Amino acid sequence: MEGVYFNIDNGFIEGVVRGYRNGLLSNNQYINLTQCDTLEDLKLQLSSTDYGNFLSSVSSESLTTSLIQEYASSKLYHEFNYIRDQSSGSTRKFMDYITYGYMIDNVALMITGTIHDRDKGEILQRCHPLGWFDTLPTLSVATDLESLYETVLVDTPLAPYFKNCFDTAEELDDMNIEIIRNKLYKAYLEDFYNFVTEEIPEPAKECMQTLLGFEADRRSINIALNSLQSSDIDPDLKSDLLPNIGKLYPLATFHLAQAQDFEGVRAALANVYEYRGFLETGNLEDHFYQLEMELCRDAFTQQFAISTVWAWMKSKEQEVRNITWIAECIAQNQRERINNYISVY
């Protein structure tokens, strides 16, 4: 079995990553955080966790629920970049695929900034730092997608994904962008899934195929619903948004693409057991995060499998979102729903 060879180049990484895994905030620790009175207490409490002294450079009067999000995220990004720097070959190739998604977000976020005439010096403070590439600010220059493709996006690794973007009208608004935004993901996920199928060893292969499958389903259910915002979005446009790799495909994705009402979507999901209950009751966004963490928790049980990088990343992403939710409740001095974080560990 491949665990025999895996450690040749990744044994060091697998150790460090699981080092981070052992640092994740536990169910009990969130409760100890929940009891704080102020952000100044939340900082002091956090110092007892594996987050350590990260905020020690921030004055008491400077703490805000915004700044805590920035610093907590910054720690994650440095740890991610450190892990990437120590990698090579297919593993380095694998990690670079992860950042593609974030920079696809950044490109969309950057272009709408020009549609609304906001300054690059401001927009570049909201971009996601893992989605950074050299030419990113140059997106500010033009409006039509053809110019942006010809002058910038031809060069970035995103270039292959634009197969279906140029069908746009000659003039651009934000609504076109979110359609373009999704079209890029469809190509990106399908390419990423294909790359996993070819170049990643088992069991990590089957693990990642599961994780990416969930993401494809999550996007599908979101898009099938939110697309009803417009007076209409054509079914052959919807079919260009829904990715092909998910559990829903093709049996359910067709109905979702064809659906023109909520009850149509609900009927479509009624058949798939994994999601049979999601729309019938309870908060939808929590259910997705709930399943997402349970999948990551299960993924950690495997060994000598590079998928741990993805499981660690998504887990700590949710950890930040847990922290900010608690901090926001603390700062705004409202607590009746402070408990609603999601903690599988």
Epitope: D174, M175, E178, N182, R218, R219, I221, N222, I223, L225, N226, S227, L228, Q229, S231, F262, L279, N283, L284, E285, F288
Partner: nanobody, 120 residues
Framework: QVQLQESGGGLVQAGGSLRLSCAVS????????MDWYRQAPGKQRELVAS???????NYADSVKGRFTITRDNAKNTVYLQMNSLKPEDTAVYYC????????????????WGQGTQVTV
């Protein structure tokens, strides 16, 4: 953060009209699509009528032709009614709301009521 709950219903004699209401909070009709679902003693639950964001109104009129829709955005609540009730109509009626949270195609806001019983 949205709380839905409905009112009215209960037992009423056949052939009479009946009126149901469903409150909504922390949100506005802008980007709102909203429905009623029946659930008979037979376990399955089903759509009967709807308010779309654009003001169109879906119905199960093949079997609920005398159920009706009302738009209440000026008061940010719900008052939907039916005429000439029949004994087969005895069901828990749930109001449902789908919120187009934002442009970003994250998971949308989705909300259900607690269900109002109806008896004939």
């Amino acid at each position: 953060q949205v709380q839905l709950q409905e009112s009215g219903g209960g037992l009423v004699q056949a052939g009479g009209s009946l009126r149901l209401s469903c409150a909504v909070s922390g949100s506005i009709f802008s980007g709102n699509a909203m429905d009623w679902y029946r659930q008979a003693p037979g376990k399955q639950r089903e759509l009967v009528a709807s308010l779309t964001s654009t003001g169109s109104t879906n119905y199960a009129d093949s079997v609920k032709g005398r159920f009706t829709i009302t738009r209440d955005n000026a008061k940010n609540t719900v008052y939907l009614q039916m005429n000439s009730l029949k004994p087969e109509d005895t069901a828990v009626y749930y109001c449902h709301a789908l919120i187009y949270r934002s442009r970003l195609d994250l998971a949308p806001g989705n909300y259900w009521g607690q269900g109002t019983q109806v008896t004939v």
